[PDB]
Design a protein around this ligand. Structure first.
Ligand SMILES: [Ca+2]
Ligand SMILES: [Ca+2]
Ligand SMILES: [Ca+2]
Ligand SMILES: [Ca+2]
Lengths: 168, 168
């Protein structure tokens, strides 16, 4: 096992259950992202029929054609993808055109999930709810709020962001 | 091919070469992230010796022990990872403790790469430099600056962010 993963675990073990629950929300979002990338990865592998790790115009053309994209569209896609005009398209270049960039921050999305009522503040009750399936109690929650504010018993996105960043 | 990937390509083809060059910077950052996740994925697969898609305490214990982590550390890692105290640790929970969260936004990182001199503004010369390995010229660059400001011939992070978001 790589030392960086080992060191990550050792740092993780020192934080509170609530901090790490919050980390798990973000971890779910990485899993989702990574699933999309995996599909693109499998797509790339199928297009690369000579298995040379890059895509020619023809390799992409013949597949887009067989799936209903018309010549005029395929050619515009090809010239957008081939950003270096090399006649060979890299994994990174292919994936840039395949990935849905809409809604691309991890911390903001986690905060929004926690703020159940979308009022822009994380209340005590928002944390009670977050831990509804965990054996944690009111002592743990109070500690978390003190930690956040040691850097109104409510938390703005900025105070949320500032706390989480200080734990990395 | 899934229709969402096809639609992503069709939207990508409509944007400028410079917009898409900027997208490629972010795409590289997704590749990096995805490589880390792939390692964690392969690690998870090796630990899961009964291939039931989750990790018992023992499965993790026996491996951390064989690599130099001491009992007292392994146990703290186990109780941090087992966030639901289930005796079974999920892929998401494992990955939360293995991933380096330090420096976790895509647009900010792209902007910083483009702002060569770290002055907080994207100048005309920063874009000239960005396209140094592309056949693009001064006409293309001017178009890009007009587009950004149609929503000082310089670009702040906010104006950069606002333009990119409007193209998603
Ligand atoms: Ca190929
Ligand atoms: Ca709230
Ligand atoms: Ca298992
Ligand atoms: Ca600059």
């Amino acid at each position: 096992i790589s030392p960086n993963v080992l060191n990550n675990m050792k740092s993780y073990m020192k934080h509170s259950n609530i901090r790490n629950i919050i980390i798990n929300i973000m971890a779910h979002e990485l899993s989702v992202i990574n699933n999309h990338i995996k599909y693109i990865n499998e797509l790339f592998y199928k297009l690369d029929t000579n298995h040379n790790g890059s895509l020619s115009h023809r390799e992409i053309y013949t597949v887009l054609a067989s799936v209903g994209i018309k010549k005029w569209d395929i050619n515009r896609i090809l010239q957008a993808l081939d950003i270096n005009d090399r006649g060979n398209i890299t994994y990174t270049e292919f994936m840039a055109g395949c990935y849905r960039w809409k809604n691309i921050t991890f911390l903001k999305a986690a905060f929004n999930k926690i703020d159940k009522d979308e009022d822009g503040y994380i209340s005590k009750s928002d944390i009670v709810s977050l831990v509804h399936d965990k054996v944690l109690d009111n002592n743990d929650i109070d500690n978390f709020f003190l930690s956040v504010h040691s850097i109104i018993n409510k938390i703005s996105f900025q105070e949320f962001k500032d706390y989480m960043l200080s734990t990395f």
